[PDB]
Design a binder for these strands. Structure first.
Ligand SMILES: [Mg+2]
Ligand SMILES: [Mg+2]
Ligand SMILES: [Mg+2]
Ligand SMILES: [Mg+2]
Ligand SMILES: [Mg+2]
Ligand SMILES: [Mg+2]
Ligand SMILES: [Mg+2]
Ligand SMILES: [Mg+2]
Length: 50
RNA sequence: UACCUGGUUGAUCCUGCCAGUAGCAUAUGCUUGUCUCAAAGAUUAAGCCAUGCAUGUCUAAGUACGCACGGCCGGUACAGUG
């Protein structure tokens, strides 16, 4: 299941401004950046060993 | 600038101090037109304090769902300033 689908959003409607919806930033979410950081942490050990 | 002078006697030569002389640093008195520097509640009380200020800090890079502002899609995690 996808977490990004099930985020609880907040409606936000002030007088004189268009209606809006806001959702929080998901924390502890596996993203390609996290995997790439782990990949480089692994890849530095190979350089040290060589 | 390696310097002296007056004072004890009726008069003289001495010892010997007092006073006289020139710097310096604290206060004080009188006086004071122009410019450059410049010390400044140490001395008696490390005695007592009204009031105000004198230590705070964010980058692309720890944590933003404060519309407090703000552009597009509009479930389509999180645009950006903060
Ligand atoms: Mg995280
Ligand atoms: Mg005489
Ligand atoms: Mg003298
Ligand atoms: Mg003039
Ligand atoms: Mg004092
Ligand atoms: Mg004192
Ligand atoms: Mg002082
Ligand atoms: Mg100070």
């Amino acid at each position: 299941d996808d977490v990004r689908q099930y985020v609880v959003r907040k409606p936000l409607n002030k007088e004189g401004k268009k209606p809006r919806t806001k959702a929080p930033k998901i924390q502890r979410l596996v993203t390609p950046r996290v995997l790439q950081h782990k990949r480089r942490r692994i890849a530095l050990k190979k350089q040290r060993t060589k």
